[PDB]
């Protein structure tokens, strides 16, 4: 936050600090929540066929 | 003593010489001025030494 300063009604202009934005940055991650199958395709029309 | 001021032809500037800053007002009353005497020996004559 910006820091103000004191003087008196006539007294010099000297400068203060100021409000800092900072720049933040996140990323969408380069890693996946992945979960993946090799479901045979022997049991598709398997499971299909004879599936209760 | 007793006269009123009589303002003159000689123009004095008023010069508002304000600053930076915001609460100060920094007047100036200037004035430049010559006595050009012509023909100094008729426009001046002195008689130096008087006793008061």
């Known amino acids: ?52 | 003593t007793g006269d009123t001021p009589s303002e003159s032809t000689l123009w004095v500037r008023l010069a508002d010489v304000s600053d930076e800053h915001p609460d100060l007002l920094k007047f100036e009353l200037s004035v430049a001025l010559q006595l050009v005497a012509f023909d100094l020996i008729d426009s001046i004559s002195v008689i130096r030494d008087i006793t008061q």
Request: glycine share 16%.
């Open chain 1, 1 to 52: 936050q910006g820091v103000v300063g004191g003087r008196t009604r006539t007294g010099a202009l000297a400068n203060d600090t100021q409000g800092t934005i900072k720049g933040a940055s996140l990323s969408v991650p380069d890693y996946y929540i992945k979960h993946q199958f090799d479901v045979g395709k022997d049991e598709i029309v398997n499971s299909d066929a004879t599936g209760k």
